[PDB]
Amino acid sequence: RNDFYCWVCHREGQVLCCELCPRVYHAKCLRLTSEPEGDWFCPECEKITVAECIETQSKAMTMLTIEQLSYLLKFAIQKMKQPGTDAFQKPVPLEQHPDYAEYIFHPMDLCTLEKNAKKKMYGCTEAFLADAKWILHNCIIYNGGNHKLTQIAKVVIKICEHEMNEIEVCPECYLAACQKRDNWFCEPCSNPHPLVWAKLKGFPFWPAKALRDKDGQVDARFFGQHDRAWVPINNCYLMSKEIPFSVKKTKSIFNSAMQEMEVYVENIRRKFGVFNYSPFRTPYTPNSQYQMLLDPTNPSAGTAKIDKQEKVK
Ligand SMILES: [Zn+2]
Ligand SMILES: [Zn+2]
Ligand SMILES: [Zn+2]
């Protein structure tokens, strides 16, 4: 059955109906410049359709099957199920709230979300977050926008958004961080992340993995502490033997990071055959392939990796 409360503001009124799902919307809540006539599809449905289309699907979805994604969604559910989330763990019982179904036409809870994931119902990360949001919408309608339970539901949805974002950055890094095997941070991914010297304003130059490029910034993951930051691309150099020196407080902390970085380099050499160090102060470039070159003085010769047509798992 179609909902009666706007998906955006959670209030009743004159609302448009989606043809594909039970969601309804005030026209003004979607800043709709005009009125749709017939066969309207809502923004949640339209975002899911383009994320599930092979021609427009994300980098992460190109490397995952539906079954593989369902395994990562199970770990995301564990992160959402924090201490204090009891009210959202099981379906709301009619024995405690007999008027619940007069207001809530589409119930949702963490156990149902978990069961749906195990049954392979979600074809993209966007679909899991869209379904999870029914928990927050339902809580606002029944309990009210200022209730203590609404505050808890908002955090549950913010955790869901962060976990979906992390899967999209790199599913292999996500899986390694979830399992936490010995020296998981040093495990190379199938398309290995470039190693750089990264300088964040106010901090010493430090070794890091480069996970993404966006608007002139690099998503750096630092060796040692495993913390993260967006760093300007002009403050990043390809890894070299000579170190870009910075005045530091504790020697041993920098030492542990350099030691961990050398374990990562050895893992790359064992798996792909090579690791090319660069001359001092060589700028990092987006999606750099330098470290994998057969001959770093002849880039047109391409990668050292031998293609054995292996099904990667
Ligand atoms: Zn609205
Ligand atoms: Zn829809
Ligand atoms: Zn990765």
Q: How far from each other are the two terminal CA atoms of the chain, in whole angstroms? A: 41
Tokens 């989330």, located at residue: 85
Report yes or no: 60 and 51 within 8 Å, Cβ to Cβ.
no
Give the architecture-level CATH label for domain 16-179.
Up-down Bundle (1.20)
Tokens of 3: 């909902």
Distance in Å, CA 138 to ligand 1 centroid? 14
Distance in Å, CA 171 to ligand 3 centroid? 7
Task: Kindly give the interhelix angle for 110-118 and 125-143, rounded to the nearest 10 degrees.
Answer: 160
Nearest one of 310, 277, 308 to 292, comparing CA atoms: 277
CA distance 22 to 36: 17
Give the architecture-level CATH label for domain 192-301.
Roll (2.30)
Distance in Å, CA 188 to ligand 2 centroid? 39
Residues annotated within the binding site are: 6, 9, 18, 21, 26, 29, 42, 45, 170, 173, 189
Distance in Å, CA 10 to ligand 1 centroid? 6
Report yes or no: 153 and 89 within 8 Å, Cβ to Cβ.
no
CA distance 134 to 23: 10
Report yes or no: 24 and 6 within 8 Å, Cβ to Cβ.
yes
- Kindly write down the DSSP assignment for every residue of 217-275, as one continuous string: EEEEEETTT--EEEEEGGGEEE--SS------S-HHHHHHHHHHHHHHHHHHHHHHS--
Distance in Å, CA 177 to ligand 3 centroid? 10
CA distance 5 to 23: 8
Distance in Å, CA 273 to ligand 3 centroid? 18
CA distance 133 to 160: 9
CA distance 14 to 233: 49
Of the ligands numbered here, which is closest to the C-alpha atom of 15?
Answer: 1
Distance in Å, CA 25 to ligand 2 centroid? 10
Residues annotated within the binding site for Zn(2+) are: 6, 9, 18, 21, 26, 29, 42, 45, 170, 173, 189
The 10 Å Cβ neighbour count of residue 118 is: 12
**Nearest 10 degrees: CA dihedral of 78, 80, 81, 86?**
-160
Domain ranges (residues) in the chain: 16-179, 192-301
Distance in Å, CA 8 to ligand 2 centroid? 13
- Give strand pairing partners of 198: 206, 236
Q: How many residues does the chain have?
A: 313
Given in angstroms, what resolution was this structure solved at? 1.7
Report yes or no: 304 and 273 within 8 Å, Cβ to Cβ.
yes
